[PDB]
């Protein structure tokens, strides 16, 4: 029994026919769109699978109902390329931790200043907030910033 689980999201998306990586259709396991999973967050059921994506690429290429580009893209929930490798519907752990830590690093960078009072901050203000946050995170926790965030910084 073979279980393909070691790929990150970039490779799973490009080897299953999805669109990488900031598409409207966010989930590799579900069909919810970017704005739809903003209202509703915690209720979703796993649907996507290999054979269903093969059949959906077939629908997109044959196009039996003759829809425009956008409607047809909506019918197949964003399957525009034939998948060739099969990938088990699971979640990578490491890059999940890295993505969540970069999200919280942006939240802290936002909270140093006041973004819910002043909704349009300037670029220099962003730089100053990141600089003072890294100064504080150097004085305590003994961390030095990184350009791209490896996993040790997340833990």
């Amino acid at each position: 029994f073979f279980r393909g689980t070691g790929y990150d999201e970039k490779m799973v998306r490009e080897m299953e026919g999805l669109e990488a990586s900031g598409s409207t259709y966010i989930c590799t396991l579900c069909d919810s769109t970017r704005a739809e999973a903003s209202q509703n967050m915690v209720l979703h059921s796993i649907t996507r699978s290999h054979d269903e994506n093969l059949e959906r690429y077939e629908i997109w290429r044959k196009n039996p109902f003759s829809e425009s580009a956008d409607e047809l893209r909506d019918r197949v929930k964003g399957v525009s390329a034939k998948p060739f490798m099969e990938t088990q519907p699971t979640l990578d752990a490491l890059h999940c931790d890295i993505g969540n830590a970069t999200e919280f690093y942006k939240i802290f960078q936002d909270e140093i200043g006041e973004v819910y009072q002043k909704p349009n901050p300037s670029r220099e203000e962003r730089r100053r907030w990141r600089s003072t946050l890294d100064k504080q995170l150097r004085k305590k926790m003994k961390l030095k910033p990184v350009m791209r965030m490896n996993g040790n910084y997340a833990r």
Binding site: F1, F2, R3, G4, T5, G6, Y7, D8, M11
Partner: peptide, 11 residues
Amino acid sequence: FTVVVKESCDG
């Protein structure tokens, strides 16, 4: 017997 095998691909 049954053997469960994890495979991985990376650049």
